Design a protein around this ligand. Structure first.
Ligand SMILES: Cc1cc(CCCCCCCOc2ccc(C3=NCCO3)cc2)on1
Ligand SMILES: *C(=O)CCCCCCCCCCCCC
Ligand SMILES: *C(=O)CCCCCCCCCCCCC
Lengths: 279, 60, 4, 62, 266, 62, 266, 4
């Protein structure tokens, strides 16, 4: 049973008890029900808050990133034969704003990968089905310089081998934070400038940034050797928090996001024009 | 200490938890976690660096 | 089994 | 090791308590789906963080 | 019984006592009183220092003036107290420190004055900056100490790309952080509406994602005071009354003792 | 023949002991997944391979 | 049993550990270990501050050199420690302070070196002065801090009546105070005779005519180190070995908190 | 079954 409270039948009043009057200076919100200020009937309440539970509010796979990777002939100028993405919920706005209703969080994370591909050029023959490698590289591990160098041997790093056309790839991740909860907001620095420092560059940090690499990166490549004709692919990453817990509520972001921190730049006018005595 | 047995000496070894100026003088080093090693028949000294951190796990 |  | 629970039935067919079954296949609890049977709490730590919480029929200030 | 009241309070911590004959009850943030780190939530293994009465007592900060053009003031904790007696010393001689706080905001005027102050206790109060440059506010500017900072009615972008000020630019109706001020009430708070009360009293627990952290690197709580309704008196266009903030550390403990941290505040 | 064990639950949903189930399908134990419930031992055969192991508060050499 | 010895000691206080493989047992002054002020001997009514691990730990002073002409060195407590970390701060922010001490004197040399140091712990070590002028040694000169002072082989009277040095003139065989050094053994003491031991260890109780007093105005204990037998080695006429004094405050408590005392040491 |  998760239903809300029944409305109580309430009659007329002529008393020294005054629930309608209060003082919001105290910091508290007046605990009033309709029966405190109007005559009410008895209602047996069946409605429920099942869908607004923290889990139910976040129980949805959100698009957090679009990684583009090519399979073509290895030439000698900059190419996308492999790609790397810094793991974050912040290249996208939607889930970011939902998570930001709270200061701290703790959860397991589900990653789902939708992979799409197409032909780039009108025609140089075709391509056989591609296998994609998605390698997790935790902070410290060697990062690839080349689409097929030794790092891809992935002996200790976790990797997904996705076959094109198969159902979207899916994995789960534990609560991997260094703290007892994830900090959606960090008012402070990773370094302090000391009076005894040589340059004053030594103690300079980014405000509100914590560890430099936070959760590491995802390195994506096409395992197949190149066809004559070029194939371009995109890996869309869907992120879902599960077994979620949250602490300290915050006002929602009201103006557009300007990078990873609380910084605003413009469209600082969220509210519309409406006349005071206009319905 | 891999010196001769006829050799004597007292050494201070220290650990300063993060956040301040890295010690350039024994005077500053004395103020943190430290062991004053006296050389003698027991050849070796052990300083334990205690887990003192803010986060539950540090990065490698 | 576990019936809840 | 099967887990059996009642579903909260919304629209009922013209046919009482209906159940569903759940079995975890993996060792890591991170691998698990969501139970979605989530308990609720009082808003009071946010709506009434007062040292002397007062009864609504009496004066807020006295 | 006898004659007691929500409006009349005495607070005593260490060798310091506060009285108030016009309070609006008092707030305990998130319903949690300050406490010490439990053995089963403990993380640094070394025996902590608990200075008690010498640090957990009422430090009064420099008074600010509230006038008709005042847009709002802000402070960060523990930063506001970094130079306050033995609390400051303990904070700088140790790598780690945790503390709760009793915050007492003071503003009296008269039965004929008008105005309302929104006093807000914000966990992790990250503020917005100067520039096109993101997350660029410098340590020295992010931390004003006792002096605190201010809000502005609008966003003046620091244009000088050659020698940037690396300062915050806190806009009032955006709570200085990209959200709307009207919603800041989800934070622990009180209102000083001058017809009702002299003062505000908020008790803050230690709030963090960790049991303890570096007080020098990170502020746990932000105190934001904004005029929800502007000061006014009789018909005198240039009215001015004082606002005094008095703060007490509570259940303060420290870990990681070594040589003193001397931050560069220039 | 099903095998049932408790998971060591890390992050808990707002809903206690949770289990998982395992069934070997093949005759050859080589075919089996890893149980990962692995016991630990003393470093002593490496850290203290001494014939007369001595107590840390007393002189190593005597 | 097992292998234990009078010569091998470990001392651990706070985050600091001392080892010694060549000690001559250790002394507890007057058979009294340091303790806190009991409720029935208490005199200031205000709740004391007990900083514990942050102040009751081993502060090492600047090393002095012992050579063939060295006549002796002296220090006063708490003065030697007035600038030592949080002990110094606690001492200066309070009107009252009491503390016991573990004193560890360090001087190693070699099986072929020669010499003997008399290490003495003196209650109320009043020293003699410069002049024809009685009780005239100035505060700044009476208190050298960590640096300590020295003894002299004879009394050189400060003659310049116009601009007097207002210094002590401690003569060695008179223990710097009008008595004979041979009798200083009635004081808590140890001897560092180099063929026998590296170090001396004396544990001092708080000794006074009061349960607590002003640490800034008055020193409780004096440490006097004199060469009872001169340093010598092989045939080298200019031998020199270090003497290091490491001291720990014990059961430290403080009363009368207010603004910091800043003495003028110039 | 075998419950451990
Ligand atoms: C800040 C912040 C960040 C978050 C979300 C944190 C999630 C951290 C996950 C870290 C690990 O991510 C992985 C992603 C994919 C894979 C993977 N392995 C094989 C291929 O995909 C492994 C780890 O919440 N707050
Ligand atoms: C408790 O689970 C005992 C009953 C098991 C009934 C048969 C389950 C069939 C599915 C087993 C999945 C094994 C996955 C590793
Ligand atoms: C013990 O295992 C008895 C219970 C079996 C429950 C049903 C299992 C269904 C899976 C059987 C797999 C057979 C594989 C060769």
């Amino acid at each position: 049973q998760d239903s809300l409270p029944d409305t109580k039948a309430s009659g007329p009043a002529h008393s020294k008890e005054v629930p309608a009057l209060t003082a919001v200076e105290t910091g508290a919100t007046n605990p009033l029900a309709p029966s405190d200020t109007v005559q009410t009937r008895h209602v047996v309440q069946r409605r429920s808050r099942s869908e607004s539970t923290i889990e139910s509010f976040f129980a949805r796979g959100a698009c957090v990133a679009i990684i583009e990777v090519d399979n073509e002939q290895p030439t000698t100028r900059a190419q996308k034969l492999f790609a790397m993405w810094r793991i974050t919920y912040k290249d996208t706005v939607q889930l970011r704003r939902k998570l930001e209703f709270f200061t701290y969080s703790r959860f397991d994370m589900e990653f789902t990968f939708v992979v799409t591909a197409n032909f780039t050029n009108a025609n140089n023959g075709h391509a056989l089905n591609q296998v994609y490698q998605i390698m997790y590289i935790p902070p410290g591990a060697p990062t690839p310089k080349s689409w097929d160098d030794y790092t891809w041997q992935t002996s200790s790093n976790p990797s997904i081998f996705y076959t094109y056309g198969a159902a979207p790839a899916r994995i789960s991740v534990p609560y991997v934070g260094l703290a007892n909860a994830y900090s959606h907001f960090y008012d402070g620095f990773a370094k302090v400038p000391l009076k005894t420092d040589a340059n004053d560059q030594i103690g300079d940090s980014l405000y509100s940034a914590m560890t430099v690499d936070d959760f590491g990166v995802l390195a994506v490549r096409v395992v197949n050797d190149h066809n004559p004709t070029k194939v371009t692919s995109k890996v869309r990453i869907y992120m879902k928090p599960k077994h979620v817990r949250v602490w300290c509520p915050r006002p929602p972001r009201a103006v557009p996001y300007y990078g990873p921190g609380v910084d605003y730049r413009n469209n600082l006018d969220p509210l519309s024009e409406k006349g005071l005595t206009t319905y | 200490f891999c010196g001769s047995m006829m050799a004597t000496g007292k050494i201070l070894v220290a650990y300063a938890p993060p956040g301040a100026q890295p010690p350039t003088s024994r005077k500053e080093a004395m103020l943190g976690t430290h062991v004053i090693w006296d050389l003698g028949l027991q050849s070796s000294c052990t300083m334990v660096v205690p887990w003192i951190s803010n986060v539950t796990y540090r990065q490698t | 089994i576990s019936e809840v | 090791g099967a887990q059996v629970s009642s579903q909260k039935v919304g629209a009922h067919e013209n046919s009482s308590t209906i159940n569903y079954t759940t079995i975890n296949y993996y060792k890591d609890s991170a691998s698990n789906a969501a139970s979605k049977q989530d308990y609720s709490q009082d808003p009071s730590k946010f709506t009434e963080p007062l040292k002397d919480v007062l009864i609504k029929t009496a004066p807020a200030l006295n | 019984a006898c004659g007691y009241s929500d409006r009349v309070l005495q607070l005593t911590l260490g060798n310091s006592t506060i009285t108030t004959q016009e309070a609006a009850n008092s707030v305990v943030a998130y319903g949690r009183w300050p406490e010490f780190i439990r053995d089963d939530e403990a993380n640094p293994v070394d025996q902590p220092t608990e200075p008690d009465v010498a640090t957990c007592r009422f430090y009064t900060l420099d008074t600010v003036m509230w006038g008709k053009e005042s847009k709002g003031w802000w402070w960060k904790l523990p930063d506001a107290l970094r130079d306050m007696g033995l609390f400051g010393q303990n904070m700088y001689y140790h790598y780690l420190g945790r503390s709760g706080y009793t915050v007492h905001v003071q503003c009296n005027a008269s039965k004929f004055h008008q105005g309302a102050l929104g006093v807000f206790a914000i966990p992790e109060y990250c503020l917005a900056g100067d520039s096109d440059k993101q997350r660029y506010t410098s340590y020295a500017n992010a931390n004003p100490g006792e002096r605190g900072g201010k809000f502005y009615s609008q966003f003046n972008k620091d244009n000088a790309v050659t020698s940037p000020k690396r300062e915050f630019c806190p806009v009032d109706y955006l709570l200085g952080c990209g959200v709307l001020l009207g919603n800041a009430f989800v934070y622990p708070h009180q209102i000083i509406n001058l017809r009702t009360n002299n003062s505000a009293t908020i008790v803050l627990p230690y709030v963090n994602a960790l049991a303890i952290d570096s007080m020098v690197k990170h502020n746990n709580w932000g105190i934001a005071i904004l005029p929800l309704s502007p000061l006014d008196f009789a018909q005198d266009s240039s009215v001015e009354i004082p606002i005094t903030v008095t703060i007490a550390p509570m259940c303060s403990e420290f870990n990681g003792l070594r040589n003193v941290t001397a931050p560069k505040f220039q």
